Amino acid sequence: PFLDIQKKLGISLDRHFMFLSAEQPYKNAARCHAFEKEWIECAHGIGGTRAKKECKIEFDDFEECLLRYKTMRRMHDIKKQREKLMKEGKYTPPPHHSGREEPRP
């Protein structure tokens, strides 16, 4: 920060709930805990300009966990192809996806 009075005195008024992997009230993990932890543990000691390209894989995995865009694309593609095939009459959905399965437990 501008005036690191917290680091001066060792207190944490606000710098302990800065992100997701940070002390949820009872120990319930937020989603992308692992991804954010890994990104942050890569980007430590480094600052900025070097972390933005030496810790890019981990940030990209985090971004896909949180915003989760490529899985939307993947399922949308699978669904679109399925609808095309069912319209053409090529695909035949099974019982365990039409609503008739043997429940496991």
> Which spans of this chain sit near another protein (rule: CB under 8 A)?
1-6, 13-20, 22-32, 34, 36-38, 41-42, 45-46, 48-52, 54-55, 57-59, 62-63, 66-69, 72-73, 75-76, 78-80, 91, 94, 96-97, 104-105
Residue type, 61: D
Whose Cβ is closer to another protein: residue 10's or residue 17's?
17
The terminus-to-terminus CA distance of the chain in angstroms comes to 53
Q: Which is nearer to another protein, 25 or 87 (CB)?
A: 25
Q: Which residue has the tokens 């890994």?
A: 38
* Alpha carbon distance 12, 27 (integer Å): 19
Q: How far apart are CA 15 and CA 25, in angstroms?
A: 15
Give the other-Cβ count within 10 Å of 62's Cβ: 20
Q: To the nearest whole angstrom, how small is the minimum distance from the Cβ of residue 99 to another protein?
A: 13
The least distance separating another protein from the CB of residue 33, rounded to whole angstroms, comes to 9
For the bound state, the minimum distance from the C-beta of residue 26 to another protein, rounded and expressed in Å, comes to: 6
Nearer to another protein, 49 or 89 (CB): 49
Interhelix angle 33-42/56-66, rounded to 10 degrees, is 160
